[PDB]
């Protein structure tokens, strides 16, 4: 029978979810005690300077916090779903906020890498590894959290695939979307902290809703330009503004390979307008400024990205209107003499 094949498959996913969850938890502990802790063990103090020992938190980011969450909360809850795997989607929904901690870890990872590049040779590590009998370096373990958060959406999608007619299919789909949500926000934020030359506080712009690379054209009212050959810009859609940056491509020494961006200009949302369709390309759309005294023709890498940008801009324009309206009514509610 079909219903039976799917229940089996659902158990397979649940088992893998559970086994990999334990391995993960166990692998984090193993390194927090096998390395992080050893950075305080006097018997090892002769293999590590004070400078390194003080940078433990840079090396491990918030791995301990992350370890705590899964070891105390998550693994326990996932296991409370063995007999009914379809309900694992609720475990995720019930703890969506907690998963925010991965944002901090990922943002700090490149920092930890940069540090690791310098001290990976330090005898302290070769020593800890030997005692742990690890064939792989600490670095590979530091990657685990990044790899784990990016596996949860695969596992959920897999569970949802075999749960269409189950009680809980909606929650699974919601869990999947929320996790995909976090992954996007985390990834989005990694671009945001790479912005250089922004005189001011980026947090005053509001939530970062979208970011991406585009071919931009200018078609400003006669009176940097990209008249015929598009220019390349990385745009950041915030609640209060659209930021235009240029992908800096200069490494230097140490070679910071992750691209950084140079702030170029901001378009204040209150004066932003949008044109949904541009002739000749389903993936082009326009972000104009001040009744079009400034017009930018953006070409998204795909029609889906274009659609996502348009919808996000529209939600912001819609909230801006609602907000602007609720404001005038609190001003107009002054008709009390």
């Amino acid at each position: 029978e079909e219903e039976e094949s799917l229940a089996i498959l659902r158990r397979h996913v649940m088992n893998e979810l559970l086994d990999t969850e334990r391995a993960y938890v166990e692998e984090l502990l193993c390194v927090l005690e096998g390395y992080a802790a050893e950075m305080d063990n006097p018997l090892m103090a002769h293999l590590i300077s004070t400078g390194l020992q003080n940078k433990k938190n840079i090396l491990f980011g918030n791995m301990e916090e992350i370890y705590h969450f899964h070891n105390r909360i998550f693994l326990r809850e996932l296991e409370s779903c063995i007999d009914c795997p379809e309900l694992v989607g609720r475990c995720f929904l019930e703890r969506m906020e907690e998963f925010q901690i991965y944002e901090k870890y990922c943002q700090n990872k490149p920092r930890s890498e940069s540090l690791w590049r310098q001290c990976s040779d330090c005898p302290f590590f070769q020593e800890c590894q030997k005692k742990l009998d690890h064939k792989l370096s600490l670095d590979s373990y530091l990657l685990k959290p990044v790899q784990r958060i990016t596996k949860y959406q695969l596992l959920l999608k897999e569970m949802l695939k075999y749960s269409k007619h189950c009680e809980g299919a909606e929650d699974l789909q919601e869990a999947l979307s929320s996790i995909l949500g976090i992954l996007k926000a985390v990834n989005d934020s990694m671009h945001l902290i790479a912005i250089t030359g922004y005189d001011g506080n980026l947090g005053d712009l509001g939530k970062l809703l979208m970011q991406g690379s585009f071919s931009v054209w200018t078609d400003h009212k006669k009176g940097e330009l990209a008249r015929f050959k598009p220019m390349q810009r990385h745009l950041f859609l915030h609640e209060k503004a659209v930021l235009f940056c240029k992908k800096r491509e200069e490494n230097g020494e140490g070679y910071e390979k992750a691209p950084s961006f140079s702030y170029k200009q901001s378009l204040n949302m209150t004066a932003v307008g949008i044109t949904e369709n541009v002739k000749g390309d389903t993936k082009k759309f326009e972000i104009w400024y001040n009744a079009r005294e400034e017009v930018y023709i953006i070409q998204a890498p795909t029609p889906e990205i274009k659609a996502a940008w348009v919808n996000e801009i529209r939600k912001v324009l819609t909230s801006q209107l609602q907000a602007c309206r609720e404001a005038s009514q609190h001003r107009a509610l002054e008709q009390s003499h």
Partner: protein, 188 residues
């Protein structure tokens, strides 16, 4: 003990995870293809000396251009995969993958790996592709792209039948043992 870090990149669905599982367990997952492949250490013997082949999957990271590269550092060899029955995964090799690993790891050699060769000669597959005027990628085409992108070489396999599977990794080992040279033009 020297370690060779091998990272497998490529579009989702080209069977990166699948290919790694099959090589390490020497058997293809019959009733359930695992989703997860944690960092794995295979002890290999290079000219009488023991080495650790450290295998890394990237499945699930394909859409995050900031998380994805966090795996690149210290890589000794990249396996750039595309499915021989997915023209788009092939297109992404020159359009997305090679440019990216080339930028992050200039001196790091990489192989072009065609997967799911067992589907290449399958009616249903041929058929499906036809509905979009597409055809499976031939070894010749792939070899040309490999020469053009400066891939150390092109190899193809089937995680299902294991044909050429072992060879993919031997080639990865060989590529990793070469002195840190910048992408050089290939013959053939």
């Amino acid at each position: 003990m020297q370690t060779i870090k091998c990272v497998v990149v490529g579009d989702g669905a080209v069977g990166k995870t699948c290919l790694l599982i099959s090589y390490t367990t020497n058997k293809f997952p019959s009733e359930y293809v695992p989703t997860v492949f944690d960092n794995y250490a295979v002890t290999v013997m290079i000219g009488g000396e023991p080495y650790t082949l450290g295998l890394f999957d990237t499945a699930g990271q394909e859409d995050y251009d900031r998380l994805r590269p966090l795996s690149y550092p210290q890589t000794d060899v990249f396996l750039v995969c595309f499915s021989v029955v997915s023209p788009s995964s092939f297109e992404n090799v020159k359009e997305k993958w090679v440019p990216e690993i080339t930028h992050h790891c200039p001196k790091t050699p990489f192989l072009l790996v065609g997967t799911q060769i067992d589907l290449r000669d399958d009616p249903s597959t041929i058929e499906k592709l036809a509905k979009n005027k597409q055809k499976p990628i031939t070894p010749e085409t792939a070899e040309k792209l490999a020469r053009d992108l400066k891939a150390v070489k092109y190899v193809e396999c089937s995680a299902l039948t294991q044909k050429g599977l072992k060879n993919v990794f031997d080639e990865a080992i060989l590529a990793a043992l070469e002195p840190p040279e910048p992408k050089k033009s290939r013959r053939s």
